[PDB]
Amino acid sequence: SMNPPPPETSNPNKPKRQTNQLQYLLRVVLKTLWKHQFAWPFQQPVDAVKLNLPDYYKIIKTPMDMGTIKKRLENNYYWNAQECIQDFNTMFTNCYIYNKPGDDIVLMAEALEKLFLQKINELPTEE
Ligand SMILES: Cc1[nH]c(-c2cccc(N)c2)c2c1C(=O)CCCC2
């Protein structure tokens, strides 16, 4: 069994900028979710080999995790906040696609997503 290569966190050909919204996403949003008790399944890519999930990457074609997001934010990978928000929503969506309602992992994603939504509600004005 085989995992795919993880999502890229560096791309010198990709335009990039530092914005106050992106710093908020690192310093407030990512920090809030990273320290949560339910964060650990989401801090790195899903290892479908060790987890014995050979169908994971057959179903999930856009994997995403907070470890990748953290490195992308720290490496200034993004152009705008929307790109980073999309990555967060992709990671939650993957969890809901692959798992059953009521699975513990879904309850964990749900709790993180609630905090995510509470924090992005106060995303500062782009300035
Ligand atoms: C998001 C997610 N994370 C992890 C996991 C579990 C233990 C260790 C590591 N690194 C990752 C899983 C998962 C799923 O969606 C499928 C359900 C269980 C596996």
Total of domains in the chain: 1
Pocket of ligand 1 (CB under 6 A): 41-42, 44, 46-47, 51, 95, 98-99, 105
C-alpha to C-alpha distance for 52 and 94, rounded to whole angstroms: 17
Resolution attained, angstroms: 1.8
Ligand 1 center to 120 CA (angstroms): 24
Please report whether residue 7 resides in a domain.
no
The CA dihedral of 61, 75, 47, 82, to the nearest 10 degrees, is -40
CATH assignment at residue 117: 1.20.920.10
Write the DSSP assignment of 93-109 as a string of letters.
HHHHHHS-TT-HHHHHH
This structure was determined by X-ray
Q: Looking at the domain assignment, is residue 85 inside a domain?
A: yes
Residue 39 CB partners (closer than 8 Å, separation 6+): 33, 66, 112
